[PDB]
């Protein structure tokens, strides 16, 4: 489950003077109690290494934008789902939250990541927008949560008028390193992001981070914090 | 409604973004076609505002290794400037490669088209490449070459439309020939042979398409698509002669606003020996259009031996493909996957660059690299060159059952017969 890592957590705060880190329990983040529930039921104790300087940030009133870079298991993924679910209002019945995955087969891990630890937000339910989705035109999703590639994320947002994406309010791209390395990726997730609302919470994280990854990120994350924690 | 298709058998592949001119200042808005390809030789041909450019066609093609960044951008690569006194919104190639069209608008003196005799261009005792003949459209404004294309067949011959709403057939060999004219008020928008060569179809303002002998003696009228009603009433803005009962059309609103999109719109035609309607099927925006500002222009080519046919537009930064069914009649959209599109990039700007100029060459011969360990054979390369000056090439990896390599070898280019100014 969760790698090891001796190192440590730096962190440059959007704001030099507004010192607000580290949590060391997720009791203290005052998430509403559906969702601590569903951490209670995934088994988590302790916020991770990443999540103890992570969650304060994103879950800051009112949130705040990141760049994060740390390795695999270091619970980025937990950390980010924490964040969507935090924002979402099942009682809506459209998608709230956009999350970017590289691929089909870790847009669906995600996804169920994502169900589990939102086991018990009732009538939560998830789009897949990612190859092979049988959606007509016409249609509209009502799912409040949508997982996907950028390519079909986009279609959804533009061409096919599935979603409108002046409605979102946190957007997360995963593994910004392998996304970009990826064909038309990298231009899609720009597309996407230009059409989201001044408000909307953005979100990213990568495993990696050159200066290609870093220049990405910071069209697409306006005023970050960012955290780095070295390899171990 | 609108028949589609999730095509796995087919992936656009991208070689590296190469940078052919300058970043412009502004967003290019007018009606332009600025690639040409010699597929016999081996020659792509640029232009824009600021002079042509020529290049061994294999010098623009370089693949991704694996570690390099695919987003980043080859700052120039080796080919040759022809320096030229005004900018050019159009260039084309005669079918035997042998005579380039660059047609230029000049504030002063309007528009002229310039023809190049290609072995000039590979004539080393010629330190300036001139053209040897022009041809000079009295008109200013009005003079904007809007569509031209030569003939496929007869390598003398090349039509030309401009903005005014004027036709020409011209001839082309030591000189230049004008065989037939048709006057502004014919309201031509749009132009495009037969594939033998052996008849004009143009689109019009009316919204109809008349065939013609190349004398310009007219044979057959296209009636504008039923569905369009008369308060919304629409103009040929391109055309494509697919088969001899074959046609892509596309539609724009007759009144010239760009806000509208128009419609890509397949046409079946009957026979004399039938007496049946014409049958179109509206496929409407295949490329979707994010852009308002540009005139529209579809750039439409047909593949035979894959039977489909490739779309681009001005206002998209997306290509799209409407193939043949295996029922042999009818087309439907190829849907594609998220990693294998063809789409033009996004400047660094953050603005949307959009196409200019559309080819594909058939001389690649290096093989296709996919992983460490596999490798494909040669596959065509569709060419974009966009709005902010960067040529995007893609591969056309086409994996359907029953389809034969399409790639043809290159020859060299003697300067025997080149024609002098």
Same mark, same amino acid.
């Given at each position: 489950?969760l790698?090891?890592n #001796?190192?440590?957590?730096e962190?440059?705060?959007?704001?030099?003077?507004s010192?607000l880190? &580290?949590? %060391?329990?997720?009791?203290?983040?005052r998430?509403?109690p559906?969702?601590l529930?569903? /951490?209670?039921?995934?088994?988590f104790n302790?916020p991770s290494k990443?999540?103890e300087n992570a969650?304060?940030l @994103?879950l800051?009133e009112?949130?705040?934008?990141?760049?994060?870079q740390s390795?695999?298991?270091t619970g980025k993924?937990?950390?980010?789902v924490?964040? @969507?679910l935090?924002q979402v209002?099942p009682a809506?019945?459209?998608?709230?939250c956009?999350?970017?995955?590289?691929?089909y087969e870790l847009?669906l891990?995600?996804?169920?990541?994502?169900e589990?630890?939102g086991k018990?937000?009732?009538?939560?339910k998830?789009?897949y927008?990612?190859?092979?989705?049988k959606?007509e035109?016409?249609?509209?999703?009502?799912?409040?949560?949508?997982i996907?590639?950028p390519? #079909?994320?986009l279609d959804?947002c533009?061409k096919?008028k599935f979603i409108?994406?002046?409605?979102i309010?946190?957007?997360?791209?995963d593994?910004a390193?392998?996304m970009?390395?990826?064909?038309?990726?990298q231009?899609q997730?720009?597309?996407?992001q230009?059409?989201?609302p001044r408000?909307?919470?953005?979100?990213?994280?990568?495993?990696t981070?050159?200066?290609?990854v870093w220049k990405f990120?910071?069209?697409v994350v306006?005023?970050?914090?960012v955290?780095?924690?070295?390899?171990? | 409604?609108?028949?589609?298709?999730? @095509?796995?058998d087919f992936?656009?592949?991208?070689?590296?973004?190469?940078?052919i001119?300058?970043?412009?200042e502004e967003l290019?808005?007018?009606?332009s076609?600025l690639?040409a390809?010699?597929?016999?030789?081996?020659?792509v041909?640029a232009?824009?505002?600021?002079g042509?450019?020529?290049?061994?066609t294999?010098n623009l093609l370089i693949?991704?290794?694996?570690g390099?960044?695919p987003?980043?951008?080859v700052?120039?690569?080796?080919?040759?400037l022809?320096?030229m006194?005004?900018?050019?919104h159009?260039?084309a190639?005669?079918?035997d490669?042998l005579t380039?069209?660059?047609?230029m608008?000049?504030?002063?003196?309007g528009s002229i088209?310039?023809?190049?005799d290609?072995?000039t261009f590979?004539?080393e005792?010629?330190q300036?490449?001139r053209?040897?003949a022009?041809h000079?459209?009295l008109?200013?404004?009005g003079?904007?070459?809007i569509? @031209?294309?030569?003939?496929?067949?007869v390598?003398?011959?090349v039509? /030309?439309?401009?903005?005014d709403?004027?036709i020409?057939?011209?001839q082309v060999?030591?000189?230049?020939?004008?065989?037939?004219?048709?006057? &502004?008020?014919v309201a031509?928008?749009?132009v495009?042979?037969?594939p033998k060569?052996?008849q004009?179809?143009?689109?019009?303002?009316?919204?109809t398409?008349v065939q013609y002998?190349?004398?310009?003696?007219? %044979?057959?009228?296209?009636?504008c698509?039923?569905?369009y009603?008369?308060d919304?009433? /629409?103009?040929?803005?391109?055309?494509?002669?697919?088969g001899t009962y074959?046609?892509?059309?596309?539609?724009?609103?007759?009144?010239?606003?760009?806000?509208? &999109?128009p419609d890509?719109?397949m046409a079946?035609?009957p026979?004399k020996?039938?007496?049946?309607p014409?049958?179109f099927?509206?496929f409407?925006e295949?490329c979707?259009?994010s852009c308002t500002?540009?005139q529209h222009?579809?750039?439409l080519?047909?593949?035979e031996?894959?039977?489909?046919?490739?779309?681009?537009?001005?206002?998209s930064t997306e290509?799209?493909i409407?193939?043949?069914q295996?029922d042999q009649i009818?087309?439907e959209?190829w849907l594609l996957?998220?990693?294998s599109?063809?789409?033009l990039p996004?400047t660094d700007?953050?603005?949307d660059s959009?196409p200019?100029?559309?080819?594909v060459?058939?001389?690649?011969?290096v093989?296709?690299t996919?992983?460490?360990?596999?490798?494909?054979?040669?596959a065509?390369?569709?060419?974009?060159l966009?709005?902010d000056?960067?040529?995007?090439?893609?591969?056309?990896?086409?994996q359907?059952?029953?389809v034969?390599?399409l790639?043809? #070898?290159p020859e060299?280019l003697?300067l025997?017969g080149?024609r002098?100014?």
């Amino acid at each position: 489950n969760l790698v090891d890592n #001796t190192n440590q957590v730096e962190v440059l705060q959007r704001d030099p003077n507004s010192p607000l880190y &580290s949590v %060391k329990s997720f009791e203290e983040l005052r998430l509403k109690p559906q969702l601590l529930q569903g /951490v209670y039921a995934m088994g988590f104790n302790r916020p991770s290494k990443i999540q103890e300087n992570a969650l304060p940030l @994103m879950l800051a009133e009112p949130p705040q934008n990141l760049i994060a870079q740390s390795q695999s298991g270091t619970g980025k993924t937990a950390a980010f789902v924490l964040a @969507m679910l935090s924002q979402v209002e099942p009682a809506n019945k459209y998608p709230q939250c956009l999350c970017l995955s590289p691929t089909y087969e870790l847009a669906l891990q995600t996804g169920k990541v994502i169900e589990q630890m939102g086991k018990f937000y009732p009538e939560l339910k998830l789009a897949y927008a990612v190859r092979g989705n049988k959606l007509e035109r016409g249609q509209k999703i009502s799912e409040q949560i949508v997982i996907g590639t950028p390519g #079909t994320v986009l279609d959804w947002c533009s061409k096919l008028k599935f979603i409108d994406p002046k409605k979102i309010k946190v957007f997360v791209l995963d593994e910004a390193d392998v996304m970009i390395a990826t064909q038309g990726h990298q231009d899609q997730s720009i597309r996407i992001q230009r059409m989201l609302p001044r408000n909307c919470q953005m979100l990213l994280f990568s495993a990696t981070f050159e200066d290609s990854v870093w220049k990405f990120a910071q069209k697409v994350v306006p005023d970050p914090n960012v955290i780095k924690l070295k390899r171990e | 409604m609108i028949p589609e298709r999730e @095509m796995k058998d087919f992936q656009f592949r991208a070689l590296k973004k190469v940078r052919i001119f300058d970043s412009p200042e502004e967003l290019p808005k007018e009606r332009s076609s600025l690639l040409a390809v010699s597929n016999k030789y081996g020659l792509v041909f640029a232009g824009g505002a600021s002079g042509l450019q020529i290049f061994p066609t294999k010098n623009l093609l370089i693949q991704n290794k694996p570690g390099d960044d695919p987003n980043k951008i080859v700052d120039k690569v080796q080919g040759l400037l022809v320096p030229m006194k005004f900018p050019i919104h159009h260039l084309a190639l005669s079918c035997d490669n042998l005579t380039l069209s660059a047609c230029m608008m000049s504030s002063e003196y309007g528009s002229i088209i310039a023809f190049f005799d290609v072995r000039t261009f590979s004539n080393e005792a010629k330190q300036q490449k001139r053209p040897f003949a022009y041809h000079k459209l009295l008109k200013d404004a009005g003079g904007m070459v809007i569509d @031209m294309k030569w003939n496929p067949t007869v390598p003398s011959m090349v039509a /030309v439309c401009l903005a005014d709403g004027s036709i020409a057939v011209l001839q082309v060999t030591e000189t230049v020939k004008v065989c037939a004219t048709l006057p &502004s008020t014919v309201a031509v928008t749009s132009v495009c042979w037969s594939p033998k060569g052996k008849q004009l179809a143009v689109g019009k303002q009316n919204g109809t398409v008349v065939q013609y002998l190349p004398t310009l003696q007219e %044979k057959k009228v296209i009636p504008c698509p039923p569905f369009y009603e008369s308060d919304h009433p /629409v103009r040929v803005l391109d055309v494509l002669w697919i088969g001899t009962y074959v046609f892509a059309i596309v539609y724009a609103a007759a009144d010239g606003t760009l806000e509208t &999109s128009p419609d890509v719109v397949m046409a079946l035609l009957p026979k004399k020996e039938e007496k049946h309607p014409e049958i179109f099927v509206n496929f409407m925006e295949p490329c979707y259009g994010s852009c308002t500002e540009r005139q529209h222009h579809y750039y439409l080519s047909y593949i035979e031996e894959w039977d489909l046919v490739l779309a681009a537009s001005a206002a998209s930064t997306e290509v799209s493909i409407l193939a043949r069914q295996s029922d042999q009649i009818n087309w439907e959209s190829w849907l594609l996957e998220d990693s294998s599109r063809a789409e033009l990039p996004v400047t660094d700007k953050s603005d949307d660059s959009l196409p200019m100029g559309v080819v594909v060459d058939y001389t690649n011969q290096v093989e296709i690299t996919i992983s460490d360990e596999k490798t494909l054979p040669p596959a065509p390369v569709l060419m974009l060159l966009s709005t902010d000056g960067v040529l995007c090439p893609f591969y056309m990896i086409n994996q359907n059952p029953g389809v034969k390599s399409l790639i043809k #070898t290159p020859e060299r280019l003697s300067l025997e017969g080149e024609r002098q100014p």
